């Protein structure tokens, strides 16, 4: 976990995120998306539960990125929830929620759901 | 947004979270759950997209909490994705993902999904 | 369950669905939405798990509706997954997935997620 | 679509489902899971939106399976929402919701979410 988490990861879409897992459960870094209404790097902050594991389980973790930087303001934020698995072929398997700011009338369709798998190798 | 977000919020289950929305999109605070394998307060970090809004839209935001503190280690993390609506009856409407650390064999059932609505009044 | 499920239900948005729970786990009926790219009634088919319950649990069930009829073809389908609770104030609590037909390029944003609560009374 | 949908499909976990897409949007068949609290075949019913597509889009569809047959009664149901893509390497990409019957107290953790990809070849 923690050490194993620190570094650069890439997913199936071609996004990249560089994160640092600090000693007490914090995750800090940047996310650069390949698709969407995103452009350049965005700031990401999150948490992981280590003290994870005498039965080779993954470490649970999650992070958030608001799609606003000095080039684009997409009026939305995405949160990724999943677990890290270390080893030869370490990966982070997640499911994500992307919510857009809407009017109360279209709030019912404000969130998209999907999944991403990240590897230390691209892809 | 930001100012409107800062403060104490409560949801339908009885949880409470106190957050501070910093000038550049950061959310920091603590979460105390009423249900679950949680006990006391946990640290939460997240982000919001303001610069939100000439058509009364909500501000998109999200946060993460790892369920580990000095009393309990649940080996899991939850991320909430949603939007803030200010006004007389301001609220944050979210959908959440709770992932548990599992073995590769039970990873397919590692995540629960649900929804929570927070108000400045309880509830 | 089954008997208790048969009838007309209404949700928070104002949609209505009339369903018949057949003896062996089948659900058949029509759905009329209030929001969306829907217009009139659409056909719905689904299943429930009864033989549900010596500890007052809800009955698990789910259904699907494709948003095509003789007035509109929205190129999408929604599935609702949840449980029925009977009693004075019986209700069906669900979470739903709405998927739209897209090109491989926008498949990552093809699904919206949300939740609906149905009562025998409107609302 | 429809014709292309009819047949036997397999997913990443090793489950199999045989379905028949009828002329007017109905899907009928059986599902046999490889993981879970399932054993043998279960009945599945659902719908698809064809009249799908001058821009090579997928056809939206969804189905439900209640995990009860003459060998097991898991007190739960799963709904799959996604789209079919035909061609050399045709597939159905979905996201699913699995809800279990619980007491009102544990209803907040009654649903798991995940994703499955089905191919005509295993896997
Ligand atoms: O990397 C990305 N994954 C997907 N989810 C999301 O929020 N934007 C897309 N980009
Ligand atoms: O406040 C809470 N909401 C629910 N989601 C979650 O992660 N734990 C439960 N507690
Ligand atoms: O009744 C409805 N609920 C929402 N989900 C959906 O698919 N369309 C909307 N209509
Ligand atoms: O085929 C399966 N996919 C997963 N989702 C589900 O409901 N059970 C598991 N089996």
Can you walk through the features of this model?
The structure is a homotetramer of 123-residue chains. The first copy, chain A, is an all-beta fold. The first copy, chain A, has a single domain, classed as Avidin-like (Lipocalin, Beta Barrel). Helices cover 0% and strands 57% of the residues of chain A. Chain A is built from no helices and 8 strands. In chain A, strands 1-2-3-4-5-6-7-8 form an 8-stranded antiparallel β-barrel. In chain A, strand 1 and strand 2 form a beta hairpin. Chains A and B meet through strand 4, strand 5, strand 6 and strand 7 of A and strand 4, strand 5, strand 6 and strand 7 of B. The complex binds glycoluril (GLL) (4 copies). One glycoluril binds at residues 11, 13, 15, 33, 35-36, 78, 96, 98, 114, 116 of chain B. One glycoluril (GLL) is lined by residues 11, 13, 15, 33, 35-36, 78, 96, 98, 114, 116 of chain D. The PDB classes it as biotin-binding protein. Keywords: biotin-binding protein, streptavidin-small molecule ligand, designed small molecule ligand with micromolar affinity. The assembly is tetrameric. The entry is titled "streptavidin-glycoluril complex, PH 2.58, space group I4122 prepared from an apostreptavidin crystal". Chains A, B, C, D are streptavidin.
């Amino acid at each position: 976990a923690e050490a194993g988490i620190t570094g650069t990861w890439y997913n199936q879409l071609g996004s990249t995120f560089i994160v640092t897992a600090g000693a007490d459960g914090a995750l800090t870094g940047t996310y650069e998306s390949a698709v969407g209404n995103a452009e350049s790097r965005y700031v990401l902050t999150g948490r992981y539960d280590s003290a994870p594991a005498t039965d080779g389980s993954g470490t649970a973790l999650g992070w958030t990125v608001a799609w606003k930087n000095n080039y684009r303001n997409a009026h939305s934020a995405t949160t990724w929830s999943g677990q890290y698995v270390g080893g030869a072929e370490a990966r982070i398997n997640t499911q994500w929620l992307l919510t857009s700011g809407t009017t109360e009338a279209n709030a019912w369709k404000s969130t998209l759901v999907g999944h991403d798998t990240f590897t230390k190798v691209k892809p």
